[PDB]
Amino acid sequence: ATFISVQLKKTSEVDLAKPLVKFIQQTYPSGGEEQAQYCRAAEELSKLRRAAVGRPLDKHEGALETLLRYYDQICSIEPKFPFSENQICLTFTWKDAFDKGSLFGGSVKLALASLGYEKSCVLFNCAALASQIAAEQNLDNDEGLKIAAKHYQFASGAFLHIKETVLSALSREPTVDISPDTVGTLSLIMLAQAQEVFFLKATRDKMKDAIIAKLANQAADYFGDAFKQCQYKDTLPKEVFPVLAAKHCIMQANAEYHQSILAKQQYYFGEEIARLQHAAELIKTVASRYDEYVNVKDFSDKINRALAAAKKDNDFIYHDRVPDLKDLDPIGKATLVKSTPVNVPISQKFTDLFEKMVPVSVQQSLAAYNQRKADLVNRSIAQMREATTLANGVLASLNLPAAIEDVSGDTVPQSILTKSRSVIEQGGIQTVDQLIKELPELLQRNREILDESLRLLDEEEATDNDLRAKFKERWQRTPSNELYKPLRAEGTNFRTVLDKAVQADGQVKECYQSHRDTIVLLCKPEPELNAAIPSANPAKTMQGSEVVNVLKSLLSNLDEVKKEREGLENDLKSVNFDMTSKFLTALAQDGVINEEALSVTELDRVYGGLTTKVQESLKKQEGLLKNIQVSHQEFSKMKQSNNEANLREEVLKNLATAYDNFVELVANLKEGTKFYNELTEILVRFQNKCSDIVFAR
C-alpha cells in the first residue's frame, strides 16, 4: 500500500555558536554567570542543530523529537539576540527538497541571513519526517492507525503554518518547495491521507456502510482538490501526480461500493447496480493506468462478485430499472480530521535554554529610559546651580548680606566672619593649593598610560612587518595594522578627551590664580582679618530702619531658597526606578513595548514632585531678585559716598566674592580629581586590552 511522503531538505553546516557568543559577551559583564550560562547554552544549541539537521538518516520519533526540540529552541531564541535588526552574519543555506526551480536546472539553493527562513525549513523537515513515519505505519493495527492519523495531521498543520509564515519572515523569494502554493498542496495531501486512515479504521471496526461511504467520499473530495491544484503546476516529485489520481479514484469507488450496500438494504436494486457499475469503471481504469503505484485486485474481485449477484437477482427476480448516474443523489461527506495548529512548544518535555536571558525589547527600552532619566536629572541640577551662582553674584555686587550687618565700620560683619570660619574649617588655602598641585600629576599619570599602551601596539606592529618582509612564506597572517585599527581608534578618542581636560584644567587654574590673594585674607584669624578691612564712619540711620528689615527678611527667604536646592539635588540623585518589570509586563500583555509613553508617565511619577519644586525655586528666586534690587537701590540713599566707605565697600564686596570663589573652586578641583581618577580605571582596562591582544598574537 502506497502513501505519499516528502523527503527532507539538505543544509550545509554553519557556525551557530560564535556569532551568538559575540553579542552575549558585549552585553553582560565579562567574568560573571550572566556571561557564563549564556555560553554553555549557545554551544548546546550549535550541537543540537547539527544533530537535528546535519544528516538525513534516522527515520523514527527519536529523530523527530530532536527536530521538534530544535524548532522550539529556534523560535524561543528570536526575541532575544537582535536578528530582526541586521548585523549578525549568520547565513543559513538550504537546498530545494524536490530539486525544483522555476528555472531549468537540476537543483537550486538559497542562502539567507534570516532566522525566519531557517525556522520554515526546520518545520518543513518536521512535516516531512512526520510524513515518512506515518507512511511506514502498519495499518492492520490500532497503534498504526493512531500514529499515522496524528502524524499526517501534524504534517498538514506544519505545512500550512509554513504557508502563512514564509513570505513575511523571509524577505526574498523562497525556493519552490517552501513556496505557499506548494506547501498548501502538500498540506491538503496530508489531510487527505489522514481521512484515508480514518476511512480505514471504520472499515476495520466494521462500522455502518452509510458512515464508511461518507468517510471515503470525504477523502475523495480531499484528493480531487489536491489533484486539481496539481494539474497546472508541476512543483512536486513526479510520482505524486498519478498517485493522487489513483487514490481519488479508489476513494470514489469505496464510496460507491458502500452506498451500494445501502441501496440494496433499502431495495433500491437498480441503484445498487448503477453504483456498483461506477465502482467497477473507476477500479478497472485505476488497475490499468496506475498499476505501477497501486494494487486493487481484491477490491475489484469484491466489486465484481457483488455486481454479478446483484445482476442475477435483478434480471430474474426484482426487475428494477437501472438509472443513469446523473439522476443519483450525491453521497454525503464527513470529515473526522483537521490541520494541527503549530504552537511552540511542539516538542515534548521542552525546556528553554535561554529562558533567563532578558529580551532585546527590554534592553533597548531600559537603556533609552536611562538617557531620558539622565536628561531630566542633569537638566534640573544644572538649572539650579546656574541660579545659585547668579544669585550669589548679584548679592556680592551689592554688598549683601554684609552691608545691613555693618554696625560701625569697625568690625568684621557677622556673615563675612561666618564664611571665613567655614573656609578655615574646610582647610583654608592649603586645600585649594594642594589640589592644584596634584592635578598636573593625575593628568600626567593618564598620558603615561595611554602612551605605554599605544607603544605596545607600535612595537608589535614593527616586528610583525619585519617578519612578513623576511619570511614572506613562513609568516602569513593578517597584518598588525588591520587587527589594531579598532584599538587605535579608541586611542585617538581618549586623546581628544584629554585635550578637553587640559583646557578645563586651564579654566580652574586661571580662576585660582585670579582669586588666591583675596582668599588668603579671608582665611586669616579674626582680629588679623579685621585689621586688614578698612574702617569707616557708619551711616547711622540703621537702628529700626524699615528698609533694612525688608532686605533682612528678604535675604532670609533667599537663603532658605538656595539652601533648599541642596536637599532637592540630593533627592533627585538618590532615587531611582528599576523599569525592567514595567517593560516585561507591557511586552506580554501587549504586542510590543512602547517605552516613550511608558517612561514619560513613570518619570512623572518618580520625578514630578521634585521637578515641580525645582521650577518653584527658579521663579521664586526671580521674584526675590526683582524686589531686592529695587529695594536695595532705595537703601543706598541712607548711605553717603565718601572715600572711607567706598574703600570698606570694595573690600567687603571682594571678601564675599572670595568665599563664593573658594566654594566654586573646591567643587571644580574635586570634580577634576574624581575625573582623572575614574579615567585611570578606563585607561588601565585599555592598557590591559592592548597587552592581551599583543600577546594572543
Partner: peptide, 8 residues
C-alpha cells in the same frame, strides 16, 4: 559641568 563626559 566642567570636565568631559565619561560614559563609554
Amino acid at each position: 559641568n566642567l570636565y568631559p563626559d565619561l560614559s563609554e
